[PDB]
Each structure stands twice: as C-alpha cells, then as structure tokens.
C-alpha cells in the first residue's frame, strides 16, 4: 500500500461533478445530429450492486426503478440507483400512483443532502426472461427519449444471474420512428420482434480509489485462487474467439484502406496483453514453487 500515491488518484475525477460542463453539454444537444451517438454506458460499482440486490430480492416477481447520473461526450455515466415502491406481477409492472410521488420526493431529498446528479435512466428486471426490450419497454423508452432526451433502458435478469454466477445487465436505446438502419441467429432471436427498433450499448463499470482500497481488504482467502490461478486455461475459448473477431476486424480494415485500423490495433493489443499477463503469472508461480529444493 506504500511506494505509491495516496491523495486524489486518477480514478476519482470520474466521481467529480461539474455543473457548468453539464449545463453546456445539455444546451449543446449533440445527440440529435448523429443518432448513433451514445455507445458507452459507465456504471458505478454501487449502482450495479444495488440493482442486482434489488432485482434478486424481488423473487419471481418483476421490479423496476430509476438510476441517476449524467452524460459526457459519447458516454453515459450512471452513478446511483434507487428502487421504486412498485407492485408487479410475474410478467408486467405498472408503477401506478406511489411510484411517481416516490420519484419526486426521493430526488428532492437527495438534492437536499448533496446528491447533485439528475435522473439518467430507468431499469426493470426480467425474472428469468433473458435480457431484451419487450414491446412495452420499447414504447416507454421511446416516450422517455422523445422529451427527456438523455436516457437509457437498463435490463437486468436476477434469476439467470444467480443461477449462472454472472450478472446480465443490458443498456439499450431506441431508434426514432422511421429509422430503419454457420453464423448464429441469436443476434435477431435473443431480441424481440422489435429487434430493428432499438440498439444495445457497451456496458462498462468503474469504481473510486477508496472503493478499490476498501475492496482490496474485502476477504483474505482468494490468494489461494491466485497462486493456483491456472490462467491461460479457463479462458482459451475467449482468446480463440477474440482472435477470430480480430481477424475479421483486420480484414475489414484492410478492405477500407484499399481510422478503422486503430480499433483493430487496440483489440490486438488487449488480447496480447492478456496472454502476456497470463504467461507472467505462470512464470511467477514456477519461480515461487518449483525452483525450491533443487
């Protein structure tokens, strides 16, 4: 924990809110020009944890809520998530009367304490029903996007997440009216009949310096799973798939050349860095264990 910096780190400016910049970016409205504008959604660790806990706590029923944050450039930042007092069946949720009063009161109370962020989106949980936009979510997301432009639909699946051990969070945004534009068919199948109406987004997560510092001492028995990590063995299929997509991207960039090369180089660097990190861990293990009593 020493021989480094302990003050405001380079992962804390993401948590800083600038009112003037947000006002300028809201007045600019760069989203209306290119409709494929937003492509990245950065969610805080706290927001994701709260969303997953609330979705799982609902049991087999469906739950819904809001999420705060802001928007910068080509990315949407989602910082906090607060639930709603909704009473939904196994398929549909309504949020009839007490949900909106809760929204207004909670936003006002949060602004009282110091929460300077505004509402940035809504989320609703599919209890084992995959991760896609239904014919009602599409309509309500279009309704929200028509007037409150900075918005995003987050879909979470609690049952599948708890059964498979991996979170299933999907960020989506709807195209406006009249916007038309051995390989698996899941690309069309896993979406509803409105597959051409909405498009997904790249979901990433971030955490603060204090978040990582406190989570470093979260538990002191994963060291065994790190020493006997067995890297380059549990994700070989991942690396082969990455190599295949990298070859496809290289072919596309070569066709274009005859700026697309930048993302291909980035993907290649990422895959190679992962492989080199795995080899480094294996070399460290070999030096630690097998180089003793020779």
């Amino acid at each position: 924990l020493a021989n480094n910096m302990q003050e405001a780190q380079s992962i804390d400016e993401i948590y800083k809110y600038d009112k003037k910049q947000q006002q300028e970016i809201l007045a600019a409205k760069p989203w209306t020009k290119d409709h494929h504008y937003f492509k990245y959604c950065k969610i805080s660790a706290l927001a994701l944890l709260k969303m997953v806990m609330h979705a799982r706590s609902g049991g087999n029923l469906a739950v819904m809520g809001l999420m705060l944050g802001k928007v910068d450039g080509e990315t949407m930042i989602i910082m906090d998530s607060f639930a709603l007092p909704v009473e939904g069946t196994e398929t549909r949720v309504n949020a009839q009367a007490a949900a909106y009063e809760y929204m207004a009161a909670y936003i006002e109370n949060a602004k009282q304490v110091g929460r300077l962020e505004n509402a940035i989106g809504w989320y609703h949980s599919h209890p084992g029903y995959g991760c896609w936009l239904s014919g009602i979510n599409v309509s309500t997301q279009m309704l929200n996007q028509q007037f409150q432009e900075p918005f995003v639909a987050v879909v979470i699946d609690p049952t599948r997440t708890i059964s498979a051990g991996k979170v299933n969070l999907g960020a989506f945004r709807t195209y406006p009216k009249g916007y038309k534009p051995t390989i698996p068919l899941n690309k069309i199948e896993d979406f509803g009949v409105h597959c051409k109406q909405y498009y997904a987004l790249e979901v990433s997560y971030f955490k603060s310096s204090l978040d990582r510092k406190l989570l470093e001492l979260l538990w002191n028995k994963y060291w065994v799973n790190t020493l006997s990590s067995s890297s380059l063995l549990t994700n070989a299929d991942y690396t082969t798939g990455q190599v295949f997509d990298l070859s496809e991207k290289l072919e596309q960039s070569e066709a274009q050349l005859g700026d697309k090369l930048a993302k291909a180089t980035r993907d290649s660097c990422k895959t190679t860095i992962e492989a080199i990190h795995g080899l480094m861990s294996q070399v460290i293990k070999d030096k630690l264990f097998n180089q003793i009593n020779i």
């Binding site: 021989n3 460290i284 030096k287 630690l288 180089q291 003793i292 009593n293």
Partner: protein, 213 residues
C-alpha cells in the same frame, strides 16, 4: 487416533508386559507413527537389560526401513505377517517422501519381492489404508504419489527441516523484490512516454507562428 489408548494403558506397566504391549502396538492395524510412545520413561529405561532387542525393533519401526531390518535379521526377534506388512508400507512411505515418482525396480529391490503382482498388491493395500495416495502405471512401470503421510522424526533432525523452510521463505522474498523492480520500471516507461506527449504540446506553439504569417 489410536495410539493414545495404547500409551495410556501402557503408562503404568513395565518389564515383560512392556515388551508384550510393544509387540501388540507393532501388530495393531491403523497405527503407523509411534512418536508419543517413545517418549515414555519406561520405554527409555528399557534400553538397559536383556530386552534391548524390543527397543531396537521399536526404533527400527519408527525411523528405519526394510533394508535396515534385513541387515540385522538374526539380531531382532521373529516377526509375524502384520509386522512385515507394516514395515513394507513404512518403507514405501519413506521412499515416496524423497521422490514423488518411484520406479518399480527400486521398490522391488528395497521390499525384496519377486513377482510384479505381489508388488502391485502391496502398493494397492498400502493405498487402501490411506497412508499414501497415488496411481500405478504399467506402461512405464512407475508409481506416481500425490500425497504421503509424514513419518516420524528424530529430535536432532528438526533443525534440518527448519533450514529447508528458511530457504523457501528466502525465495519468496526474492520473488517479491523482483516484482517490485519490474513494476517500478514499467511505471517509469509510461511516464517517459507521457513526456514525449508533452513535447507534442510544444507543437501548438508553432501553430501560433502561423497566426503571424
């Protein structure tokens, strides 16, 4: 375990009864490490007299192996099948302690048996009693051991193991140091590159020049 009852019931006995209890312990199934028994005062004082052969047999069972037993076959008293089986199992444990890949020829030489079937049966019955765990292989004629019990240790050999542990610690330290060096260098590289980026900053100064012209 089981040796606790034996030592408790043999605490208050001495003489030929002590030798009988020692023989019963050596014949008792499920007992493979006779460490606490040797600490008894009666067994220690048994050295002087006409029954030193039993103490020598106990020491051989605790530390020695089958070739050591066959070296002084005449000196030691006769043993039954259970004692010989236990001695062979302890010899297998001692061999597996040094190397984790025991050739068949070495086992045949030390255990003094002819047929390969007998050796395989002995190894299997030693695996059954859970002293060792491993797999035999007839294609290459070798036994691979994944885990073996810790045999008895003498009082003066403890420093030995201590030394080895010390070595391991040292190695760990070295690795840690190396890692630190590596990361430091990496960070330096990054910062150096950032310096080059700041040199690109000077470029916009030239842009100011094209403002004049």
């Amino acid at each position: 375990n089981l040796l606790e009852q034996f030592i408790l019931l043999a605490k208050g006995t001495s003489g030929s009864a002590l030798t009988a209890l020692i023989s019963q312990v050596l014949e008792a199934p499920g007992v493979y490490v006779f460490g606490e028994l040797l600490e008894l005062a009666n067994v220690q004082e048994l050295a002087e007299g006409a029954n030193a052969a039993y103490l020598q047999l106990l020491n051989l069972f605790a530390y020695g192996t089958y070739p050591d037993y066959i070296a002084n076959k005449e000196s030691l008293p006769e043993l039954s099948t259970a004692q010989q089986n236990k001695l062979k199992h302890l010899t297998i444990v001692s061999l597996a302690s040094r190397m984790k890949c025991i050739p068949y020829s070495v086992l045949l030489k030390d255990l003094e048996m002819r047929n390969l079937r007998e050796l395989e049966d002995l190894i299997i019955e030693a695996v059954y009693t859970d002293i060792i765990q491993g797999k035999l292989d007839q294609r290459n004629q070798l036994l691979e051991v994944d885990f073996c019990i810790g045999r008895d240790i003498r009082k003066k050999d403890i420093n030995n193991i201590v030394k080895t542990l010390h070595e391991w610690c040292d190695g760990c330290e070295a690795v840690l140091l190396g890692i630190e060096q590596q990361v430091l260098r990496a960070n330096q590289y990054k910062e150096n590159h950032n310096r080059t980026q700041q040199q690109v900053e000077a470029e916009v100064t030239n842009i100011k020049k094209t403002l004049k012209a």
